[PDB]
DNA sequence: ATCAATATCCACCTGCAGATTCTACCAAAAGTGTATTTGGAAACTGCTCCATCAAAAGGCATGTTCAGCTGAATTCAGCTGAACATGCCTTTTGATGGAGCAGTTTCCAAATACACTTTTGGTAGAATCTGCAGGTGGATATTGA
DNA sequence: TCAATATCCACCTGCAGATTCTACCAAAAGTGTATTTGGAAACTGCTCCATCAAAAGGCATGTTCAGCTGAATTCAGCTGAACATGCCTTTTGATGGAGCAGTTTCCAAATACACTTTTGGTAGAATCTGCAGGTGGATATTGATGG
């Protein structure tokens, strides 16, 4: 490729560590948590990735059912509403 | 293009009636619109299945009343039902 | 040297983050995680910015709710520090586990 | 060269005006500067727009074809060392389109018919060891002495079949111009005196000698005469301004025999219940039109006729084996209708001969498959099976309204009406679905249940039409003896029907070959 | 020349809600009074939660209601809270709540 | 007066015979089976209508009920379910 | 002669009855031809596997007649079917035998 | 026949339910609060089921209305449908 | 002969987990349902199957609830349930 | 009890993206007006099945005791919170290619809408069959002692 | 490792309940014929998504130190468990009638559809305005400093 690489999909990795320690600390503080053990962070990351896998799977199956290659917000709203997470401000 | 309908003007009129000097933000307005849509669809489905229960093929105000009592928790319904009645009462006045 | 006792600053950020509403998880790393998950599901997908924002606010809401339940469970066990058993019990009672 | 500069400069300037289409090609690409070191290691000829600009300015272009070849060559090496999703790729495509649309009339002005650097389709080859299959395209093949070719599984030089054979050229007597052979429509056999361009003929007030290889000069037959008279009468009735006279010629008619397959040969003829072979007559008729004063073949049809002196059930039966056409008929709107007329007239003709039943196998070809005419036009949308069925049904209904055809049915319903009990009562035709599938299932009411289920699976595909001394003598012709020989000649000599000019050239070559085949 | 919304004293559009409930194919037959009743319940809920949001905004020395005000309004009323128990308000945050043992005491 | 009430009971009985020729079902458990099959029917059909509304499609066909199978039924269950669904629609189409 | 759509698709659940119930379900004004076939196939599949699981539970319980206890044992012991019915109560099913670790002696 | 049948739900009944719930030790304050939870769920099911009842213009509640109430509260009950 | 505290407890645990029979006595639950229905509308008649469905559903809900409360009590390094366990279980479930 | 190093509250003021204010169009709503259809109101009534009561019976309501569970008091290894240095990588503004989402036409394969013949599921009554609920006999871990 | 007891099983035997067979027919279901239309493909306009570029500072990352919370241990008040004893509330069967449904009439009420009027979005430009963000200094909040 002329422009830098050539069809660089850039297969992703190590993203869950992108959810940093202070980020999980802030999420816990919004939940009223005062003290956080060291092994809380990774298992909260695990819960986060489980939830994201579920919601993204539902939304993506929604989106090939719509015959689309781009994930919109409306099918996401559908996915969470089915999963028992009714969300506002997005359609 | 295709028009996307919303309750913007009606919710704004209600807000002006109940709070003349207050404004609403765009995100809060989207929350308002999705709220009214969710209540609409939940009540519509509940009343429709009540129609299915009694082999009732027509949607009238009665199963709408029943859905309001079932879904709206207690005191809210005690007004909601009443308000609807008043409305249909006025609709049965001309 | 002036030093605050453990807990006072904790409650400081408690009230700060219970008063504010701005997103606490960084947008770019979360979006990278979303792209990873989608690619692991189906390759060659594109994501709208509003969709990523919906995922961000939704996951923040789910995490803060689970953290409130975790704190309630921790207080139930006569403790102030959250533990893995806290979240495990909260998720089991909620029924997704 | 300065007059040539004036002739060719507007097109290059128009190419320059394309922004930002021409920007990557305005300055000489350097591998180090652009960051792509593998540019000049693959292509052996570096150039750009500025190279031709300075070549024009200096004045070393002896012929405009060098200019055209250089432009198409930078286009080729641009697409070669580029991904299709890239921006320079679509810029190169747009510049090529602009070049064509600008240079065609300008190059026409200088005297040449056209100025397109054209190449033929990828010429698929054939194997030599097994003598039955061919060399696959875009796949590994082995070649020896450029005359022997083999596939991957035959022998069990290595290359993948992607070469393109360029179009040939001819030279004028008083110009020496490298004119397209196809475009000017010049055949060595037709005019052995020498190729002369139209400009020289106009200047000298001379006209080319009348072509004696035309389709109209072909020997006439009663069937062909009847078909052409019917088509011409229909066209005269329509009276469209774009309608031209149509010539239908039967170029092959020979008696042949069809043999029973061994699977049912053991079962029936050996036991003494079915004929050992069936004699029929194969015929080949083609339809031609005079478009722009040039003959063009736009239809082909292959039939098998079993007359009265034939064992049953094949007796008095006409079967359509292969039919093909190219959508260059003028006017277009009547084209389909004209085809129907042919599909009517022949039937009526055999109805005058005393034939009873007609058979049609309405199956569209697979992708990249040609029946008679080779290299169908890319824009010729091949019909789907149901659309083809409706196409045949319209012709059948039109024939019924004319009382020519009594009725038609599917083979399953025809067998049900006929109360068929054994497979020996089913008509046998050369190359048909049933002769092969009967043997195949025999390899797998012992046989009648399978056959009835097979018709039930494919009832709509087969059409049976309820409608002998032929007054036309036999016409021996090995080239028209089946579609295989014509396809082989078209592929070997590059006789393509993709374009109108190529269709005309192929028609001329085919007519010359037919007229020379009758000379022994 | 009187609209059904003005005829029954409705602020939400009777025609629009009737059309939307017909378009959802909840049934094959729909009477006239049901869209009016549903619309009326709509103004009722909208009006009460707007009062709550405006009160929250006034408590926060604000004259424009924001999603934070909506969340404070919904979560501070037990009936609206149970109406929206499985519900998240975007950019609404959570109610300030600290368990007693967390306090220094 | 005889008022008939409809149920998928007998078909479930043939299903049991196909899967277990020498096994029976009590009336209480059989009503459990009927309630389960009715619940699955209602959920899948409702989800199919939900997808039809979402993608602005006014006709219910096999594609969206297949999608509802993917969304609602568990992974292995959903995959194998799509399997018999495709097999059955092809068999009926070729019938 | 007049093959039933259930037999035409090789299914034992009634395609026609599913089609009728989905029509008068009012989920759409129009219904496709293959939708009742596909849906009847899905319901037959679920009923099948729950039947083999219940029969296996009954055989492990030394019984030849499947009871609701066997259905509960089958559905709860399969985690996929468990979360399929994670919010559904079965009549006369009981609960899985489960003793807690800390509640155990010594 | 005695009144306030909320206490009529005998303490060994709560004991047996807890035994089915896997609980081996039951506190003295468990019984009253389990009674409270039971009765709360009870007015929920009775209220929505009887509302289904006057929706049908009937004076008798049916078991199928009970199924409606339970499934609407997210507690779909099998065997009575 | 006296069994130690817990052995008979776990014996009843196994006995009631291996059985599916009704545990709430029919008549008191029927009477309670009667007065609860009386609190909302007067002069009602109940089907026997309706009472059975109400009772069996309620035992199922409470059995799941006591599973939850046993888990919550175990969470606090305990084997005995106390009111804080039922409050925690119901709060995490979200009925309140 | 006072005091100093910080976080908190908050009034004020400026630039601006977002909130609010008119003009004009207008197709999709929204409304009004007959012909048509049928869903359900209304009255009479057969038939379930639901309220009520007596005796057979299967557990439910209380007092004792102490084994063991729960909870208070003590101690400490260590870890996670508080503060800080370093820099990174995320955030914000800008532009741009173009894959892809989306609007418009055509028109056919698939849908609906009855008419009709076929078979098929639901129900009632007889009578034979059968898995299993307990009841009796050992009797086999098993747990307290 | 003797001994009392709940319970798995070896066996059994009666029955409510599950299974088999004949008959009927209104209710569905498949086939046929006509009509209607939903969205596929074919083309193309156009919003927005992925990608690249560059600067910079808000917190990410890492280390240090010690505060106190989780975890372990010990032991005492006592709340429940196990169990014997008395009775008593419940279950089951039988029996009057309150209403759930089956039948018939018919009228207020809900589609169907062709016009005709009203207006909810909404492009585009203009003015208004609540509050984001930074400044500065008054006011709790914390923690351990003199004694």
Author numbering:
A (entry chain F): 11 to 101
B (entry chain D): 31 to 124
C (entry chain E): 38 to 134
D (entry chain N): 1051 to 1206, 1232 to 1519, 1578 to 1600, 1612 to 1664
E (entry chain C): 14 to 118
F (entry chain H): 30 to 124
G (entry chain G): 13 to 118
H (entry chain B): 21 to 101
Q: Which sentences did the original study use to describe this structure?
A:
Here, we report cryogenic electron microscopy structures in which a p300/CREB-binding protein (CBP) multidomain monomer recognizes histone H4 N-terminal tail (NT) acetylation (ac) in a nucleosome and acetylates non-H4 histone NTs within the same nucleosome. p300/CBP not only recognized H4NTac via the bromodomain pocket responsible for reading, but also interacted with the DNA minor grooves via the outside of that pocket. This directed the catalytic center of p300/CBP to one of the non-H4 histone NTs. Representative writers of lysine acetylation (Kac) are E1A-binding protein p300 (EP300; KAT3B)8 and its homolog, CBP (KAT3A), which can transfer an acetyl group onto the NT lysine residue(s) for all four histones. That is, p300/CBP reads H4NTac at the bromodomain pocket, rotates in multiple directions, and rapidly writes NTac to non-H4 histones within the nucleosome independently of the DNA sequence.
We determined the complex structures in which HAT is directed toward H3NT (p300H3-I·H4acNuc) or H2ANT (p300H2A·H4acNuc). In all complexes, as in p300H2B·H4acNuc, bromodomain of p300BRPH bound to H4K12ac of H4NTac, but the position of binding to the nucleosome was different for each. In p300H2B·H4acNuc and p300H2A·H4acNuc, bromodomain binding to H4NTac interacted with the minor groove at the superhelical location (SHL) + 2. Importantly, in all structures except p300H2B·H4acNuc, HAT of p300BRPH interacted with DNA through one or two basic patches. In p300H2A·H4acNuc, the density of H2ANT toward HAT could be modeled for the C-terminal residues after K13 (second panel from the right). The distance between the substrate-binding pocket and K13 (~30 Å) suggests that p300BRPH acetylates only K5 of H2A.
